[PDB]
């Protein structure tokens, strides 16, 4: 059976709470059995167990902004979206902003056509510098 894995790079958008991603830089997309759809979601063709992870670095100031929350979300066919993993972080009080990072990951059952995406409290505060923010999965 083919290896099934994806690793995508953060992308800024002037447009949401849903983070955007791109296949660029040192990305992974082993085949069409995982696809980045609409710049927003990793969609899997095959049912099974997957390790799913996201990295979010953000840059905020406490005065200049409730925590920053990042959510790994699942949309399965015929089901309402739901949260699989969530992390929080206090805002820094560094000026003009301080960077903090969150890492989420775990093993989940996915159904054919299921999609995962990452939501945050404020997408505009996300750090997009090389390596800071990424999203991926691998089929066990």
């Amino acid at each position, epitope marked *: 059976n083919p290896q099934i894995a994806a690793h995508v790079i953060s*992308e*800024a*958008s*002037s447009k949401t709470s849903v983070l*955007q991603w*791109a*296949e*660029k*830089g*040192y*990305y992974t*997309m082993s085949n069409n059995l995982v*696809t*980045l759809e609409n710049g927003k979601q990793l969609t899997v063709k095959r049912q099974g167990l997957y390790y799913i992870y996201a990295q979010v670095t953000f*840059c*905020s*100031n406490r005065e*200049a902004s409730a925590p920053f929350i990042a959510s790994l979300c699942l949309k399965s066919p015929g089901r309402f979206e739901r949260i699989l993993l969530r992390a929080a972080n206090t805002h820094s009080s560094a*000026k*003009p*902003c301080g*960077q903090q990072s969150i890492h989420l990951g775990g093993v989940f059952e996915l159904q054919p056509g299921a999609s995962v995406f990452v939501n945050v409290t*404020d997408p*505009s*505060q996300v*750090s*997009h*510098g*090389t390596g800071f923010t990424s999203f991926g999965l691998l089929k066990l």
Partner: antibody, heavy 118, light 112 residues
């Protein structure tokens, strides 16, 4: 109209600093990344770095990390670049430009000539 | 860093002649859905103006005579029929990784 209006030409001695400004109107200033780009006389375009106006987060081209400081004043919809220990090789037109996604740069300021000379 | 080499250095055309210019990247800047290659026009003493984004998308308000094509390491910009205001320098730019870099430019020059 989307507009980036840069400060006037600077003529300065080696060793000095200048603070360049770039005033943005006609759009939501915090919604777009801003780049600064160098164009030395007769040459092409070189990226200096980028600022997110919503928080002040920066990323530099390694070459300019000790040359250039980038800031914004959100209240004034203005981006600034300070160049330090100026020398004749810093002589160029410097552009600010906005970017919706850190891919294309869809509107540019008119440029600011910085001449460094004895 | 990625290097972009534009050819030719100078292209000589008349108004009403088709012009195609090319850009070759030191590595591929295309993936599943998009190419991270953009094209600019610059006239002396003026700032660059975006023409083409993600290899083949005409920027809003750019005239239909401009088009872009290409993938992987190789991209082209075509002006279907050159007009007097098209004589300029054209620059390619990638957004594949940090830092974005620009080509060294193609001057579109008036043939006689």
């Amino acid at each position: 109209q989307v507009q980036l209006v840069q400060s006037g030409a600077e003529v300065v001695k080696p060793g000095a600093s200048v603070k360049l400004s770039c005033k943005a109107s006609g759009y939501i200033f915090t919604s777009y990344y801003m780049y600064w780009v160098k164009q030395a006389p007769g040459q092409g375009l070189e990226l200096i770095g980028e600022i997110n106006p919503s928080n002040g987060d920066t990323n530099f081209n390694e070459k300019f990390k000790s040359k250039a400081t980038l800031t914004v004043d959100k209240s004034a919809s203005t981006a600034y670049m300070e160049l330090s220990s100026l020398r004749s090789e810093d002589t160029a037109v410097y552009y600010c430009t906005r970017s919706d996604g850190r891919n294309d740069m869809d509107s540019w300021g008119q440029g600011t000539l910085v001449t460094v000379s004895s | 860093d990625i290097v972009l080499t534009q050819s030719p250095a100078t292209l000589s055309v008349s108004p009403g002649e088709r012009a195609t210019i090319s850009c070759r990247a030191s590595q591929r800047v295309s993936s599943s859905t998009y190419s991270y290659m953009h094209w600019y026009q610059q006239k002396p003493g003026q700032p660059p103006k975006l023409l083409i984004k993600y290899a083949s998308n005409l920027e809003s308000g750019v005239p239909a005579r401009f088009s872009g094509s290409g993938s992987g390491t190789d991209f082209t910009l075509t002006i279907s029929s050159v007009e007097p205001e098209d004589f300029a320098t054209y620059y390619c730019q990638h957004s594949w990784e940090x830092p974005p870099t620009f080509g060294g430019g193609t001057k579109l020059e008036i043939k006689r």
